[PDB]
Write a protein that binds this DNA or RNA. Structure first.
Ligand SMILES: [Mg+2]
Length: 134
DNA sequence: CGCGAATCGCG
DNA sequence: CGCGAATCGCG
């Protein structure tokens, strides 16, 4: 399996798990940052990876782009394909924002179609995903 | 730590 | 029992 350079890659920057969550999507070839979500005060890394893929799908759909999305999160990929984020994070006032975003991203998936292939980034073969926060 | 995938205990 | 609830492998 080979890298598709004409693609978008996403990843999450965490400060703890659970902890602060941010994410971004970048051009796999050029590294150009295409979208970014500012820090969400608490979430899980998995929830962040899920939001990052869905944000990518919405971004690419708006632009009518047929580029695939790479994610290094097998869990988030499954959640998007299932249209269901199977997170165990407690729902309270502290976690209200991350859950609002996850709920909305699920709602988007259940009310839209998309052509974007969602591919697993193979870190062990290809090194770090381009959206890595380092 | 959170996930998906892969031994227990109660009815 | 045997099925549904309750450690492994990884990132
Ligand atoms: Mg990540």
């Amino acid at each position: 399996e080979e890298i598709i350079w004409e693609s978008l890659s996403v990843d999450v920057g965490s400060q703890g798990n659970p902890g602060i969550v941010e994410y971004k999507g970048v051009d796999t070839k050029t590294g150009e940052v295409l979208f970014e979500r500012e820090p969400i005060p608490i979430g899980t890394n998995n929830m962040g990876e899920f939001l990052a893929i869905v944000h990518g799908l919405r971004y690419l759909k708006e632009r009518n782009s047929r580029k695939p999305i790479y994610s290094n999160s097998q869990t988030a990929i499954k959640w998007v394909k299932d249209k269901k984020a199977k997170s165990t994070l407690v729902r309270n006032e502290e976690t209200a924002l991350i859950w609002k975003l996850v709920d909305e991203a699920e709602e988007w998936l259940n009310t839209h179609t998309y052509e974007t292939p969602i591919l697993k980034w193979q870190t062990d073969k290809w090194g770090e995903i381009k959206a890595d926060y380092g």
